[PDB]
Structures are given as C-alpha cells and as structure tokens.
Amino acid sequence: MKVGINGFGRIGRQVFRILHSRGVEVALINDLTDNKTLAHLLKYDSIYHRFPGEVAYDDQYLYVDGKAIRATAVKDPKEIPWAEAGVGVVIESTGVFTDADKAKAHLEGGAKKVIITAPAKGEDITIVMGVNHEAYDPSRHHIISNASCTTNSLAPVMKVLEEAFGVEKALMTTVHSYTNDQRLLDLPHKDLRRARAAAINIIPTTTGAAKATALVLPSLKGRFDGMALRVPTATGSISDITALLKREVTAEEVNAALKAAAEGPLKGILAYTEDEIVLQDIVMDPHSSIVDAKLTKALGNMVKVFAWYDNEWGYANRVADLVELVLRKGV
Amino acid sequence: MKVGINGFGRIGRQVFRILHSRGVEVALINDLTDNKTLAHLLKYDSIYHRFPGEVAYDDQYLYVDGKAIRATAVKDPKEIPWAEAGVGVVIESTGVFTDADKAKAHLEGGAKKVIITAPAKGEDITIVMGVNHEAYDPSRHHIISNASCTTNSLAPVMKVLEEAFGVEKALMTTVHSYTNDQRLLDLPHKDLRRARAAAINIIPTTTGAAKATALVLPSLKGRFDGMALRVPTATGSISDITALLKREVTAEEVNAALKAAAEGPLKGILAYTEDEIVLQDIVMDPHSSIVDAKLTKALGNMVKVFAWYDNEWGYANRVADLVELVLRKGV
Amino acid sequence: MKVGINGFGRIGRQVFRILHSRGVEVALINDLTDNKTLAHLLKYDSIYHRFPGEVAYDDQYLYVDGKAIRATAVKDPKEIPWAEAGVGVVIESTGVFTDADKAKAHLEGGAKKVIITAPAKGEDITIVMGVNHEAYDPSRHHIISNASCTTNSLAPVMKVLEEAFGVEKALMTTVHSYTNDQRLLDLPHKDLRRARAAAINIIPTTTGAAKATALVLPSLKGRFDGMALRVPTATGSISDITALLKREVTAEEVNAALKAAAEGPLKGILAYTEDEIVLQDIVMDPHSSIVDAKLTKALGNMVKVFAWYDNEWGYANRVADLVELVLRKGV
Amino acid sequence: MKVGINGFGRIGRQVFRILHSRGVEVALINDLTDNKTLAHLLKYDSIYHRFPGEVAYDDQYLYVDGKAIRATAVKDPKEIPWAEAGVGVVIESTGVFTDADKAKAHLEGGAKKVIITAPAKGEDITIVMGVNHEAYDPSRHHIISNASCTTNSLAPVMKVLEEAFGVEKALMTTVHSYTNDQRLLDLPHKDLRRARAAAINIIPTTTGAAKATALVLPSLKGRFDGMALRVPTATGSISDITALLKREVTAEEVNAALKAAAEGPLKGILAYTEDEIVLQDIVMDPHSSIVDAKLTKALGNMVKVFAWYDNEWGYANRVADLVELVLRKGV
Ligand SMILES: NC(=O)c1ccc[n+]([C@@H]2O[C@H](COP(=O)([O-])OP(=O)(O)OC[C@H]3O[C@@H](n4cnc5c(N)ncnc54)[C@H](O)[C@@H]3O)[C@@H](O)[C@H]2O)c1
Numbered sequence A, B, C, D: 001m002k003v004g005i006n007g008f009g010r011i012g013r014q015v016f017r018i019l020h021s022r023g024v025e026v027a028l029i030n031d032l033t034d035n036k037t038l039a040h041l042l043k044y045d046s047i048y049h050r051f052p053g054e055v056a057y058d059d060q061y062l063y064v065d066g067k068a069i070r071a072t073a074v075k076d077p078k079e080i081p082w083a084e085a086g087v088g089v090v091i092e093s094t095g096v097f098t099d100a101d102k103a104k105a106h107l108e109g110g111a112k113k114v115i116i117t118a119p120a121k122g123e124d125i126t127i128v129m130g131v132n133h134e135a136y137d138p139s140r141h142h143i144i145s146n147a148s149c150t151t152n153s154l155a156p157v158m159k160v161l162e163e164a165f166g167v168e169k170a171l172m173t174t175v176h177s178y179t180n181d182q183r184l185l186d187l188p189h190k191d192l193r194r195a196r197a198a199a200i201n202i203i204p205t206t207t208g209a210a211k212a213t214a215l216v217l218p219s220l221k222g223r224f225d226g227m228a229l230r231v232p233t234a235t236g237s238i239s240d241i242t243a244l245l246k247r248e249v250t251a252e253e254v255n256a257a258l259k260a261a262a263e264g265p266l267k268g269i270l271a272y273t274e275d276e277i278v279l280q281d282i283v284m285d286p287h288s289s290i291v292d293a294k295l296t297k298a299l300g301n302m303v304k305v306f307a308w309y310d311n312e313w314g315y316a317n318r319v320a321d322l323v324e325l326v327l328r329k330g331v
C-alpha cells in the first residue's frame, strides 16, 4: 500500500525527503498547519538546507516535482482519511500518540500499520534495525516502535560488545543537541531542567534509551542505564558508553571488533572511523552509530566507546528503512 | 493598594525582582503552572542569575524573604481573586491579553488599574516614561500600556533629536536578541521568518515599534518606520536609527544634544557613553536607551545614531517606574 | 599560466573548491602549516561540509582527485616558488599583505598578477565584478583588489539605485557573521570591540565598505558611509542600506528596479527574492547580493533596501570569477 | 611579600579580582599589550561583567581604586623587574611557560616562588587545594603547579570515593566550555579536533586531568583516565565520573558520603546540591567541584557521579587560595 505521515516536524520532513528519493510513495500528510506553512518548511530547512526539487501547494495538496500529496490538518487520528488515500502505512511523528492506545486510532482510520517514531507504551514490538529487525512477524505485529534516536546509537555498539566480549554492566551518557521538547529562554516545563534556556546551557536530563536497549538486547535487562546532557548545538550527538566486560581487552581489540561489525553484519547501520572528526562532520550521515575509534579507552575490562549519531537524519534513515521492511513483508 | 502579576514569565519575573527590591508589595501572581516551578524559576535565572534572597513555597503561596505571596493557576483573567487579595494594580505580562478588551477582565476581578507590558490595542493610554508620562490622568486612564521594549528605546532619542534639530523622516532597524515568541528549531508559526531556528539564524521580522513612537511623539506620525533583525543572543538589543533632520549637523552636535539630555531631563532613561562597549556590557542596565556616542555618523542633515538597550531589564525597570507612578497618585 | 594561492584559510579553501570545480589549474598552495593539516582542513569544513572528492597528501604535495598540487610553508612571499610551479596568477588571501608594496613580492617570485582578496592599499585597480570589471587593463593592471565582502554586496545594489532613481546620500549598516579576525573569548586586540567574545556579543565595529563603493562608483564619493555589527553566526551576512534618493518612489517601484537588474545585466551577481527566508537559506548561495524584496520600506525619497550575502561562498565565487577573467584576457 | 602576575588573560584577570577583593597586594602585572587595553579588559568582562571598582591607567601603571600597579609588556620572563617591585610570588598565567625550566626565569628576575596555573612539566610540586596542600614544603618547593580546572574538579570527589568505599578503576569525561586555545572558525592548530570552529561544534579532545589525579591521590596511578568534550558554552563545565568501587553501594550511600565531605573537611572546596540546576546556575561559583546529587546512579558496585565547576572562577579561587598559603607559610 502507500505511506502516510502524521506529524510533519523534524523527523517527519526528513523521513519525507528520504522516502522521496528512494522512490517510496507518501500519499497524505497530516499536521496542524496550513499547506503554505507545510510547504515553506519543507523547502527550507535550517540544517539540511534547500529541498532538492520543486515545491508548491494549493488548499488541499502539496506538489512535489509534480506528484500530489494530500495535506490535511485533522487534530485527531480517528478522523484522518487514511483508507480513502490508499495509505496502508502510517508514520506517526506527532510526538503525542506514543501510548499505543492512541496510535491504535490510525487503524480504524483504515491504516494497516502504525510506526511510532519514538519509544512507545504497550506497542506490539520495538525494532532497532540491525539488531532485532528479523523479529518482525507481519501476522501479529501492527503497531511498531522504532525506538529513540539514542537507543539506536547504543544498540548496534552494545550488540558487538556483548557478542565478542560479553557485557556485565554498563553506564552511558549522551551529549545531545537540543530538541523541540526544550525552551529557548527560561520557561515553565514538566522538567525543571528542560525548562531552561536551551542555547546558553548544558542541561542534564534523564533518559531511558539505555534501559530500553534491553528490549532489543534482553541480556542487558537490568544491567544498563544512563543519563543525557543537552548542549547548544542543533542536531548531532554523541554517545559515551562505559562498559564493564567479562574479560580483559585492550582498545585495539574493542576497536577491531567494532570495525569488523561495521564492514560486515552491521554495515549501513554501524560505521567506524579513524579520522579526527568533530560534530559537523557527522551531520547528515545516515548511520545509526559512528564509532570514533581514536577515543576508545580500556582499563582492562572497563572499556569506554564513543559513537556519534545525527539524531535527525540518522534516525530518519532508520524510520525509512523500517517502512521499506514493513512494506516488502506484505503490508 | 497591592500589586498582582498575571503572567509570571521573563518580564513578569524581572519586574517582580525589581518591585521586590524597591519596597512595593506584590500580593498575587498568577500563571499556568504549580508553585514549585514558579519558586524555582524565580530562584534561578540563566541570565540575571540567582535571586538574592530566600524563596520557598507551599501548595498555596510563595515565600520570598518570608513574605507569603498568593500564587494561582487560573487560565481566565475573570476568575482571578485580585479583590479578594487586596490587588489594585494588575501587571499583565502574559502577552495574550493585549487587546484591552480581554484585558478589561482584571477589573471585574476587583482591580482598578491594569498595566499591559506590551503594545496594547484599545488602551486608555500608552505611556513611555521620561517622554509622555506627565499625561497620565488617574481619573480617566485605567488600562495603561508601557509599550514595547524597542519603542521605549527610540522615543527618548527621537524626542531629543526633534527638539534640538527637528526630524523630517527617519527609518530604523533594531538588532535584537531572540525572545520567547520564536522557535528553537524550525517549527510552524504564523510568521514564517519566525518559524525558523532562532539560535543559528539572523531572522528579519516586522515591528510596529517605530510607528508606535508616533503615539508619544505625534510629530513623527507617518514619518517614521523600521524593521527588526532577531539575532542569536539571549538578551540585549541595539537600535540603529537613520534620521533625516531639519538642518545640517555634525556628529559632535548630535552627540552633544544627546549627552546634555542624558545629564538633565532624561537622567535615568537615556544614558550616553564614549566607552567601546559591546552587548554583555549593557546586560542588566536599567536605562531605557544607551547612546553609543562613538558610533554616531552624520552626512550633512542625514544622521545615524545607535542605542543599546537591555530588552528585559531596562524595560522591566520602566514597568516598575510606571507601577510605582500609578500608585504615587492613588489607585 | 597557472593559479597559485597564498593563504589557505577560510577564503583560500573556498576559492579552491570553486577553482577546482571550474577546472582551473591551481599549482601551488602556501600557508604556515603541514600538508596533513592543509589536507584535513580542506577535507572537513564546518560550514560547507565534506569536500566532494579525494584528498591525500605527502611531505611534498596535496593530491586532490589525483592531481598533485605543490604545497609549501613559506612565511615570506619573495621566497615562494611561483616560477618553479608555473604560477602566473597568485591569490593573496593571507590577510597580511594588503599594502600592495608587500604583495609586490609575489611578482619577484615569478608571478605575473596578484589578486588581493581584500581591500588593498596602493593597488593598480580595485575591481568589483559586475560593476566595473570592464576597466581591468591587462596591459596596466597587475595587483588587483577584489574589495571587501561587504563592498561587493553594496555595489551591485547601489549601482541600480543610482541609475534608475539617482542617489543623493546613503548610510548603511551590515550585520555580519564573525570572522577570524576576532576572539573566541576576551583577549587583546588592536580594536577594543573586537577584543571581545565573538559568540556571545553583538559587536559594533567600523568599516570602510561604504567609502570603498566610491572606487567602483565614483558618484558616491563623499556621499555614502556605514558601520558593522558582528553577531554570533559563523557565516552569512546582510546589508541594511538606507538611501536618500532623487525622486519620490514606492517600495514596489524600488523592488522592480532591483528585480530587473537581477534578471538582466546583473545576472549572476545580484539576486532578488520574494520568499520569507532567514540566514541559513542564503548560506552557500553564489551571488554577491540577494535582495530580500519583502523588506523594502519607502518614506517618499528615503528608501531602505536589505541584501543578504554569504561572506565566504559568495565572495569566493567572485574571486574565482575575477581569476577567470584575468586568465581569459592574457597573462 | 608582594604578588606579581604574568599573563593577564582569563585566569590572570579573574585571579586579580579575587586577590584584590581579599586584601592581597598585586604589585606588577605583565602581559604583551598596552595599559589602555589591560584596563579596559579588566573593567569590562563579557562573563562576570563590570569590575566593581574604579579602573584608570597611564603609560606605566594601572589604577584600581587608587592603587598603582606597575604594568608591562615584556616578552621574556628573565627581563621582568619582579624584584624592583618587591614581588615574591609570581603567578605564571600566560600559558607558554608551563615548563618549569622556563618558568624558572622568574626566579632569576628576583622572585622566590612561581605558581603555574596549569599542569606543569618539571614542577617541584603539584597541589590541588583541599587534597594535598599539607605537602607544600616551603624550603624545597618553589615552582608549584596548581593543576588543571579538571583535575581540581575530579580530585575532591575521588578522594571521597576512595576513602569511603575504595576505587578499583574509573574513567571520566568532562563536558567543558570552550577556551582560548581553541579556534573561532576552522584554522590550523596542532590538534586537528581543536582546529575546528568552537562555537558550533562538540569537539572531542584528550585530557591528562584524570592521570594527574594520581599525582595527588597516589592510590589511583594506572586506575584513572578519561576524555574531554568541548561544547559551545563560554564558561562552566561538568565532570562525569564512572567509577568501579570496591563494594556494592546505592546512590544514597554515595551522596551521603559526598554531602558529609562538603559540610565537613572539604568545605569550601567541594559542594553538594540537590537542586535541579543547569550550567548558568554555577557560573561564578567559587567551589572546585559541585556534586549534582540528583544525577548520581549506581549499578551495584558501578557508580556514576556528576560535579560542575566554573572553570575560570572556581579555579582562579583555587589559585588565589594557594597564593594565600605560599604567603602564610613564609616566602
Ligand atoms: N528530533 C529528534 O532528534 C528525534 C529523533 C528521533 C525520534 N524523535 C521523536 O519523533 C517525534 C517528533 O519529534 P520531532 O523533533 O519531529 O518534533 P517536532 O516538534 O518538530 O514535530 C512534531 C510535529 O507534530 C505536529 N503536531 C502536534 N500535534 C499534532 C497532532 N495532534 N496531529 C498532527 N500533527 C501534530 C506539530 O505540528 C509538528 O510539526 C517525537 O516523538 C520525538 O521524540 C525525535
């Protein structure tokens, strides 16, 4: 069937640009704004710049290189014209329908599969491409979570570590660009930390990306946890894992294990580099995790690995990848 | 009577800090959050830093320096206990009750005078201290307005220009720190320029600040206009004014007029300096507009003048000065 | 003859990327560092991202896409092997040999022309592509200045305002991203303003960009001047020109002039747009000036135009255009 | 005796303000620039703002509240009149004379003690106040190094972990504000990660701060190590310590330990808080390290702790303190 998107925001537009170049068909887009705003933001992105194609619109459609996309503005999933558009797969990027109770609503909209682009509650399955994607059974799995941007950077690295060396416990910190859940200047928020001026602060905040890695790598259940620090950058992040392994290693063995995963089984998902790169060098990179080899440290069995990831673009490519998988499998 | 504050935000909290240090007694603050958050934001400020005094709170009041202050979470100004609390002067800084129509609600609640800290629609009077405050009339003016931050910075200067030389036409641009009406990252908004990422962009935006100056200095009616460029700083702004005067002058003469005013009549509102300062140097300056004398240029009768202003602190001192005026004349 | 670049920094590398894609042959590059560093900085740029191609090096050469470019590290220009490399045209982008007398040293190295990529002093001719490029006389011009990034944005516009409406007086201000002549945090500088923290201030600094337009447009001699405000952005600027013209006009009228120039005689140099763009949308745009049509204001004869420019990319393209000109006309 | 300061930069000037507010007499300041500049730089600070005193100057002295303070521009330590000023303790804060063999010239010039505000090479001793100042020996120790901002932040925490539970191994990352050894925009540098533009990048960098902790807590030799991440903030850093302890602990045990140290023996050096603060909240805080109580986590015997530190102010205070001890111990 066709793909439909609810929530045309940061992940939403990026997934669109990507699905668009791969030649996947997006038939309807629903946000809470007029088509004129939907088309301006798609044409101009502050981070990824000019859209490479022609964008136009009318009161009911988005026109991209001549193809037409229904763009609506229904604040409720139930009433979104899924079936009538030919949409079997609904990417759900609003950020407000992560309880699978609420995401279920696209189904009686006529949608066949919902893919929550964030961690879900009561979903059918959480998938992280590269790690447990073979776990997908189209007979029983309909409401799928693709996990968070962070859990997708942790999982591929943790998997290599657990298989080559065995992991006993682990803690991690992600130093992350700010996102739209934060304030620009001091302002009321559910979290007294995120309530602060995102661009002139380092903001410690909680995360469950670590705990959630246990969903795709059960062996870590109860042995992985972490924290997050938000910093004044717009997109782009880095995961700082500190693992306690089951044997003694040297940086070279750890790096060598990561590099081989990156050129074999985890190809396209996990990457590995030896250059002296900074944040800007990984922006718009499509990998879920980019191992910066020169930073690895090992104190015997307490090792420390670092993986960069573009929380927008990389995630976005993962959503795209999943959608193609839900599709090739009969959806 | 006692001062209440509806809208505990950026301006709301600085005014409070200023009124608190002056001896005025605030008696109720209303916002949309809980007392914990309120107490917290008051105590810690990313820009003005720590609140100098003890702040605490129960599920009812905030205790600043032991003095309890009622605090509520009422979304409708009509349902606010101003009277019940002994609140004569309400400070409206939520920035949603700017049409004096809705603003009028605080009157039903028991208030006698409302002060909109923004450009209002349908107000009794619009005052800019130092310029036309001698025109406030207790018996007829109930819904005052202290104008915008930018308006407050131009007026003092324009007054000086007009009286000393006379203005024929004048256009201006204000380079201004971002504010809470902008976005962190590209997100929908009514103004498409402001839908964009605030901190990594120079954003042109429209401003009524020049036109609104004509309301306090009527001679400029239809003779003054401007633009605004929002830049990536969190507080502090500068006004670049290009005036076409009625006689040929030298920068020296223009500087001399502006200095004389700063030392005399406008003392306390207009400041003048010859030091080579920069943004951070005016952060937390209470003045309405500071003249950077070394930047004055003059081509005959065409002059260019600049004036920094701290859009949060400077402006908030004006609000306090007015609240304290409205009170010095019986509410 | 071939091109050689002296000073491989922000402008030199961009000019290179461009000369490179245009097929011009750069034979020798000189800076103050090793090839590993020249190669790395070239390969990874924070603003324009990965170099689209292969970069390698050795103790003696930089290999860009398989081509060998002699790369050296000589502090004195008299000592650069221009002759030994076959370099006829040198690009002087160090920023330290702007007094033509010092830049003369290049000719005593075997070089036949020098193009100072900055306002010069003592130059044969200062050329602003599109405005007065026809005056370059190969027979008599050898040390050519391409003027500042700002002058190049003011001249294409002022030229149009002078021919269609006639300019009588003008003052401009340029809100500019910071450059390497500034400081990261407070440090001594010849300029007490530039001595301050570039990324957290708005820094007023002086500029001769206005008076310089008078070299390419003699009619502005004694009639145009300005200022600059450096702000927290990496690259990209905007010029705010306030002109006093000779006839009364309407904004639409002024835009129409600009737009026409933009699609005819100034094609490729000047650009005109009507979309509601912000800074990020003009990064890596190749024009010298991009008229932001919706910003024009007009109070009779006093007009106000705004033109964006990317001080790195735009300027670089102009340097590449001048080099190609110099070459097409016989060295 | 009297204090002399070589290298009036970020640390030099903060140290002066501090020593000045304490009653310590600074007799001579040397740097490489003119007096006008030093004074202006002292008077106006982008981060801590205005110097709260009268600053004036003339061709040979600075004047802070009336006191004359000799000021000079001597490029070589050997040629400094340290003695002619009756200067006994020289604060070597330029950043180029951290090699004791080089800082030794201050002695030749007449001083008796040299305090290098940075990790040295060949120093008689390395002190980190609150941890090992009891080892300073006046008769033997003449060229003292006060360690790095980072070590001073790790040390007190490590001391408390080691004594309460015992540290097996531990690694750490410091998320740190940028500093003057980094670049504003891509420019050659020895470190290719630091050659990159500082204000728009998360720059990974090497630090020996974990290894110097062993110099003061010798039980850590070969059991401690780590990385640094520079971020687009101007001042303030946070340390993220992942320590493997000698027994199973709970977050409370650990914080209980740390709280107790702060209220007790480490008072004034270590601090403890349970508020949900962020970076700006610690700027200008005088403590070497501040435990963010709520950020602590523990997986059995693996713990993670976070401690903030204003790298200019916390440190300059430590520098002031050591100056005070070297004086009280007798020069
Ligand atoms: N940005 C990241 O780095 C990142 C990475 C991976 C996953 N995610 C997750 O993806 C989601 C989207 O985040 P994002 O950054 O794109 O945020 P965003 O705030 O840019 O996008 C949210 C969009 O939803 C729209 N919206 C709000 N309510 C709506 C509704 N009821 N129906 C239709 N449209 C509605 C908003 O108009 C907006 O365009 C969140 O769950 C987020 O946590 C974000």
Ligand SMILES: NC(=O)c1ccc[n+]([C@@H]2O[C@H](COP(=O)([O-])OP(=O)(O)OC[C@H]3O[C@@H](n4cnc5c(N)ncnc54)[C@H](O)[C@@H]3O)[C@@H](O)[C@H]2O)c1
Binding pocket: A186, A187, A188, B006, B007, B008, B009, B010, B011, B012, B030, B031, B032, B033, B074, B075, B076, B093, B094, B095, B096, B117, B118, B147, B148, B149, B179, B180, B311, B312, B315
């Ligand atoms: N920020 C400045 O530079 C500044 C300066 C001068 C004037 N102004 C004008 O002042 C106003 C305040 O802006 P601010 O910057 O303080 O913004 P803000 O967004 O920081 O303040 C708004 C606060 O009021 C609360 N509020 C919103 N709806 C509420 C309601 N319905 N009833 C009660 N409280 C509610 C919000 O939750 C928040 O606490 C605006 O009108 C603005 O245009 C702002």
Ligand SMILES: NC(=O)c1ccc[n+]([C@@H]2O[C@H](COP(=O)([O-])OP(=O)(O)OC[C@H]3O[C@@H](n4cnc5c(N)ncnc54)[C@H](O)[C@@H]3O)[C@@H](O)[C@H]2O)c1
Binding pocket: C006, C007, C008, C009, C010, C011, C012, C030, C031, C032, C074, C075, C076, C093, C094, C095, C096, C117, C118, C148, C149, C179, C180, C181, C311, C312, C315, D186, D187, D188
């Ligand atoms: N940055 C811009 O926006 C821009 C735009 C227009 C014009 N310009 C002008 O062009 C020049 C370059 O500015 P930039 O921003 O590229 O500078 P930059 O600081 O980025 O680079 C200058 C390079 O010159 C090298 N260098 C220094 N001295 C040298 C020497 N004596 N011999 C050889 N190489 C030497 C430096 O090591 C450095 O790599 C300046 O004149 C600038 O004023 C800059």
Ligand SMILES: NC(=O)c1ccc[n+]([C@@H]2O[C@H](COP(=O)([O-])OP(=O)(O)OC[C@H]3O[C@@H](n4cnc5c(N)ncnc54)[C@H](O)[C@@H]3O)[C@@H](O)[C@H]2O)c1
Binding pocket: C186, C187, C188, D006, D007, D008, D009, D010, D011, D012, D030, D031, D032, D033, D074, D075, D076, D093, D094, D095, D096, D098, D117, D118, D148, D149, D179, D180, D181, D311, D312, D315
């Ligand atoms: N800034 C911090 O975060 C921090 C923290 C702890 C330690 N330090 C260490 O302190 C030192 C200074 O750092 P800063 O950040 O104050 O640096 P900075 O670059 O601001 O200070 C340098 C000052 O030293 C002056 N100087 C340089 N060479 C000189 C010389 N030859 N003679 C006299 N004066 C000279 C410079 O002109 C400038 O005034 C470095 O060793 C640094 O690593 C800095």
